[PDB]
């Protein structure tokens, strides 16, 4: 798991996100969609977004970024005690949305990138280590639920 110190770093970084949840959310999704266009195909409601300018201009994309990062934030504040929060997420992304675990790796990487981009020189080596551990824990617990369901893609 994560140490007390590590959780404190995680929630300190998260305070930076919370100052502009929609901006961070928008940028996370744009990084994901532009880096991995196959992911855009999982969103019938974002399929019409044919350019990055269109992505930037979409208020609905910002709304969804808000929903996604609010859910992750709730999970992170549980400091690993997140079975109740995580289980329904795991189940909807496997059975309804059909999201391979690879795509959760992609969005985890996108969060790290966006943190550096929005906070250059203010996201230290210790903070990146801690946040990376937290995202891996999140991914690994979802992967366990995916294995239960026999889900691959
Ligand atoms: C940090 C990781 C993620 C979190 C916290 C998250 C959270 C959420 C939440 C809270 C919802 C709405 C409730 C639900 O349907 O369960 C949602 C919907 C959805 N998610 Fe995610 N998600 C994550 C990653 C992803 C990724 C990587 C993809 C695809 C590449 C994805 C695809 C979708 C789709 C297609 C919907 C339904 C969108 C719609 O309203 O049409 N999610 N997600």
For 82, phi and psi rounded to 5 degrees? -120, 20
Ligand 1 atom 23 nearest Cα: 68
Pocket of ligand 1 (CB under 6 A): 39, 42-43, 45, 67-68, 71-72, 89, 92-93, 97, 99, 103-104, 107
Method used experimentally: X-ray
26: left (phi over 0), alpha (psi -120 to 50) or beta: alpha
124: left (phi over 0), alpha (psi -120 to 50) or beta: beta
Atom of ligand 1 nearest to the CA of 44: 41
| SS3 sequence of the chain | CCCHHHHHHHHHHHHHHHCCHHHHHHHHHHHHHHHCHHHHHHCCCCCCCCCHHHHHHCHHHHHHHHHHHHHHHHHHCCCCCCHHHHHHHHHHHHHHCCCCHHHHHHHHHHHHHHHHHHCCCCCCHHHHHHHHHHHHHHHHHHHHHHHHHCCCC
CATH of the domain at 129: 1.10.490.10
Q: Copy the structure tokens of residue 94.
A: 């496997």
Q: What is the resolution of this structure in A?
A: 1.6
Please state the residue numbers annotated as binding site: 64, 93
Query: Ligand 1 centroid vs 75 CA: distance in angstroms?
Result: 14
CB 31 within 8 A of CB 87: no
> What is the dihedral sign for C-alpha 63, 71, 26, 45?
negative
Q: Copy the structure tokens of residue 53.
A: 């300018």
User: Which range marks the domain in which residue 113 is found?
Assistant: 1-153
Domain count, the chain: 1
CB 94 within 8 A of CB 32: no
| Separation CA 61–CA 90 (nearest Å) | 22
């Amino acid at each position: 798991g994560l140490s007390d110190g590590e959780w404190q770093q995680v929630l300190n970084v998260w305070g930076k996100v919370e100052a502009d949840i929609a901006g961070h959310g928008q940028e996370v999704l744009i990084r994901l969609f532009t880096g991995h266009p196959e992911t855009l195909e999982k969103f019938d409601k974002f399929k019409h977004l044919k350019t990055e300018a269109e992505m930037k201009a979409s208020e609905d994309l910002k709304k969804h970024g808000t929903v996604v990062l609010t859910a992750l934030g709730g999970i992170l504040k549980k400091k690993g005690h997140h079975e109740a929060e995580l289980k329904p997420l795991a189940q909807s992304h496997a059975t309804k949305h059909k999201i391979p675990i690879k795509y959760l790796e992609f969005i985890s990487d996108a969060i790290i990138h966006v943190l550096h981009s929005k906070h250059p020189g203010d996201f230290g080596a210790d903070a990146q280590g801690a946040m990376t551990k937290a995202l891996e824990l999140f991914r690994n617990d979802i992967a366990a639920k995916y294995k239960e369901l026999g889900f691959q893609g």
